[PDB]
Every structure is written in structure tokens, then in C-alpha cells.
Write an enzyme that holds these catalytic residues in place. Structure first.
Site, PDB file in Angstrom:
ATOM      1  N   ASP A  35     -12.670   5.255   3.235  1.00 56.09           N
ATOM      2  CA  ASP A  35     -11.223   5.238   3.443  1.00 56.09           C
ATOM      3  C   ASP A  35     -10.742   6.589   3.950  1.00 56.09           C
ATOM      4  O   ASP A  35     -10.524   7.520   3.171  1.00 56.09           O
ATOM      5  CB  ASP A  35     -10.519   4.848   2.131  1.00 56.09           C
TER       6      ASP A  35
ATOM      7  N   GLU B 224      -7.005   0.250  -4.585  1.00 54.91           N
ATOM      8  CA  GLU B 224      -7.040   0.242  -3.118  1.00 54.91           C
ATOM      9  C   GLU B 224      -8.347  -0.295  -2.492  1.00 54.91           C
ATOM     10  O   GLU B 224      -8.277  -1.180  -1.646  1.00 54.91           O
ATOM     11  CB  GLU B 224      -6.689   1.634  -2.561  1.00 54.91           C
TER      12      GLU B 224
ATOM     13  N   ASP C 194       0.868  -1.163   0.000  1.00 54.64           N
ATOM     14  CA  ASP C 194       0.000   0.000   0.000  1.00 54.64           C
ATOM     15  C   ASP C 194       0.914   1.225   0.000  1.00 54.64           C
ATOM     16  O   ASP C 194       1.551   1.520   0.999  1.00 54.64           O
ATOM     17  CB  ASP C 194      -0.912  -0.047   1.237  1.00 54.64           C
TER      18      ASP C 194
END
Ligand code: NA
Lengths: 40, 379
Positions: B197, B174, B7
Site C-alpha cells: 500500500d 484497510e 477510506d
């Protein structure tokens, strides 16, 4: 795009190809466009 | 056999290793399972990547690179870039319609980098974090990007990986990675997924569908300048004002004290997700008294309530742009450490008429976890 995912999986399975790590619908559609004849 | 999922976040990055059929999230040199996406340079030209750079920001305010992901893969006169350069304290300059980051390292030395090159340094640090733990080299990676990223931004991110010595097997989204980490890829039928998020500096909402275990990004929204750091900074301001009232002194004149305060505030924010009270200390070179005050959960909530409430507006917007009602949402996925904050969990649950978010993975690690799962599949 309009086809369901089970139908897209079936197309690839009918062509003897598997979609390894195809997380998204676009991954299936990408691989189908690479195998499908368009210019018959 | 070992592969990695990374990530590459705006503020924080995370690495998972896929090995023996499972994912392990790796801690860095400081024992932290997330690493700041921050880069600084020593006067001798050595790279300081992660915690060391973030932790000296106030003393090196104009030559500490961060938020390179805001610029990556973009053109100079992109209105996004032109707005973001207003907020970035380091120099960003145009070369041939593209943004470049320029820093002074000392002694008449200036270094200039494409955003790709900065992100490559962050990826190298994540690679080396995994390698230090395992005692062997890692090479094959999945790297994640925001769902809204275009082909140029995806290519730029891949290029950053290539510079870092990684074989980037795939760039994946993501929210999709997060959905996979939480196990949503096992869901049968047709379902609608809201991914909420809240990162350190950005807020992204994505509407995903699942159909026979396969995802599609339908719409995205959010707030590019709302993040966990905003909650920290409001608390820092509160304590800077309290310090001024107690001591008569401006703690901002002590740059290291402000940096130490930021750590105390971040620690308090974490503590207030499980406790109702936390202590924050201010140590300074210029004051004999070690300042020390409590912050309650209620006060933390009061200081930030308008920001917490503002997270619902982009959720409303994504539903509108996907022709969905709140009742059409089947799954809710929370990503980012800030989503542990009880008031945020409360507001999301209340917005969706009591519906439970998915549980089981640390929300700061979910994206890297999913990336590593996919790296496993792809290898
Ligand atoms: Na982030």
C-alpha cells in the site's frame, strides 16, 4: 486461535449463530467468546 | 437503501456507496474520486475541506491542516508523534498528554482541535460528497483504519465518524478491505497475501492469511514517510532547478506558481504510467515567459529510483517477521495510485519471481470499495 476457520464457523453454526460481516478470524473468535460458557 | 464505505486516508480519502447490491465510487465537486484529507479555515471561520485546502497550501503553509491521521488516537510523548511534529508545518501542542492542532484563521482568532475533530471534518466532506451525488442523506458507514491501529486509534476514528453524523457500523482494516475489493475473499484453502500500500505520504505492507475465506493480519511493516508525494516533490525540485537555469528566477518566491507546478507534476506522473513523455508548464505572476519542458518516463524513474527500490526492504522485513519466504506468497494486492507506476509494478513482480498482482479495481479506490462491500454485508 489455533483452530482452523472451518472449525470456528462450525462452532458458531452448532450454537445457531451466524457471523454477519466477520471478515477476520478475530471476528469469529470474538463472537465465539460471547456465546461460549467458560465457568462450568 | 444506501450505506457507505469510507477510506479515511492519511493524504487522500475515498467514498463508495453500496446500493442495489453493488458499489459505486463517488466523484467530488472537482470530478475527483479521491479527496485530499486536508482542512483549512476561512477568516470568517468556514471550513474548506479537500481540494480547496490542498490547493492553497503554499500560500497558507502554517494553517492548512493535513496528516491528522498520523496523530489520531496517540499520546503526546509517543515517539511517533514527537518525530512527526518535526515535519508538520502547522502548530501541534500538548494538553494533558495529548496532541492538539492549532491554527490561526485571521483577526486575532485561533482555533484548536483534537485530531478526531479534523478527521470528523474530512468524514463530513466524504459524507456530503455521496449525498450531493445521490440527492439524499447517508448515515450508515464502515470506516477503515491501518491494520496496526490499536483500540484507542480505532475508537478515535469511530469518534470522528460520530462527530460527522455517521453511524459507524464497524471499523475494519484497510488491507482486508482492499483484499475484499480485489475478490480475494472467494479464495479457497489456506493462502498468504502480501498487501503493498503506497499512499500519498505513507507506505504500508501487511501480511494477511486467508483460511476458508476469512482473513488474519499476521504482520505489518512499511515506511511512515515514503509516499507518492515524495516522487512529485523530486520532480518539482528538478523543474524548479531547470526554471532557475532558464529564467534566472526563483519560482519558490511565487507561491501560486509552485502550487500550479505541483498540479502539473501530479498530472505528468499519472500520464507517465501509460505514456513515455509528458509536458510540464510553469506559469508565474513575475515572469512573462510561460516555461514548458518535457519529462520522460526514464527521467521520472531516474529521479525516484532509490525511493522505488526502498519499497522492497519493508516487504523483506514482513516476510522475516512472519517466518515466510517470498515463495510462500500466494496473492499480491497493490493499493494506492502510486502502484500504477510501471517501475514499481516491475520491482514488485521481480521481487516475487514474476508473480502477478491482483487486477480489477482502481488501486486508489480499493479500500473504499471493500469498506462499501462490508457496509453492504453488515446492513
Ligand atoms: Na493516503
Amino acid at each position: 486461535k489455533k483452530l482452523r476457520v472451518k472449525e470456528l464457523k462450525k462452532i458458531l453454526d452448532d450454537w445457531g449463530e451466524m457471523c454477519k460481516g466477520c471478515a477476520e478470524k478475530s471476528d469469529y473468535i470474538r463472537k465465539i467468546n460471547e456465546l461460549m460458557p467458560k465457568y462450568a | 437503501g444506501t450505506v457507505v464505505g469510507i477510506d479515511l486516508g492519511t493524504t487522500y480519502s475515498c467514498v463508495g456507496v453500496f446500493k442495489n447490491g453493488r458499489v459505486e465510487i463517488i466523484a467530488n465537486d472537482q470530478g475527483n474520486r479521491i479527496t485530499p484529507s486536508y482542512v483549512a479555515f476561512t477568516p470568517e471561520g468556514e471550513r474548506l475541506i479537500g481540494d480547496a485546502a490542498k490547493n492553497q497550501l503554499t500560500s497558507n503553509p502554517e494553517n492548512t491542516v493535513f496528516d491528522a491521521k498520523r496523530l489520531i488516537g496517540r499520546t503526546w510523548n509517543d515517539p511517533s508523534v514527537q518525530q512527526d511534529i518535526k515535519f508538520l508545518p502547522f502548530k501541534v501542542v500538548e494538553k494533558k498528554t495529548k496532541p492538539y492542532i492549532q491554527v490561526d484563521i485571521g483577526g486575532g482568532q485561533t482555533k484548536t482541535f483534537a485530531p478526531e475533530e479534523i478527521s470528523a471534518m474530512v468524514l463530513t466532506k466524504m459524507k456530503e460528497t455521496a449525498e450531493a451525488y445521490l440527492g439524499k442523506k447517508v448515515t450508515h458507514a464502515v470506516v477503515t483504519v491501518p491494520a496496526y491501529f490499536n483500540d484507542a486509534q480505532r475508537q478515535a476514528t469511530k469518534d470522528a465518524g460520530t462527530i460527522a453524523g455517521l453511524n459507524v457500523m464497524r471499523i475494519i482494516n484497510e488491507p482486508t478491505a482492499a483484499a475484499i475489493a480485489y475478490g480475494l475473499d472467494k479464495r479457497e484453502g489456506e493462502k498468504n497475501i502480501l498487501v503493498f500500500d503506497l499512499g500519498g505520504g505513507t507506505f504500508d505492507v501487511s501480511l494477511l492469511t486467508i483460511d476458508n475465506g476469512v482473513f488474519e493480519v499476521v504482520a505489518t511493516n512499511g515506511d511512515t514517510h515514503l509516499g507518492g508525494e515524495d516522487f512529485d516533490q523530486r520532480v518539482m525540485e528538478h523543474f524548479i532547478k531547470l526554471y532557475k537555469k532558464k529564467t534566472g528566477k526563483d519560482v519558490r518566491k511565487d507561491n501560486r506558481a509552485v502550487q500550479k507546478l505541483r498540479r502539473e507534476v501530479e498530472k505528468a506522473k499519472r500520464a507517465l504510467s501509460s505514456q513515455h513523455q509528458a509536458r510540464i508548464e510553469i506559469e508565474s505572476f513575475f515572469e512573462g515567459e510561460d516555461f514548458s519542458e518535457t519529462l520522460t518516463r526514464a527521467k521520472f524513474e531516474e529521479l525516484n529510483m532509490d525511493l522505488f527500490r526502498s519499497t522492497m526492504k519493508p516487504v523483506q522485513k514482513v516476510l522475516e517477521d512472519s517466518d515466510l519466504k517470498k515463495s510462500d506468497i500466494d496473492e499480491i494486492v497493490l493499493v494506492g495510485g502510486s502502484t500504477r507506476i510501471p517501475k514499481i509494478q516491475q520491482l514488485v513482480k521481480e521481487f516475487f519471481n514474476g508473480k502477478e498482482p491482483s487486477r480489477g479495481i482502481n488501486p486508489d479506490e480499493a479500500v473504499a470499495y471493500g469498506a462499501a462491500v462490508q457496509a453492504g454485508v453488515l446492513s
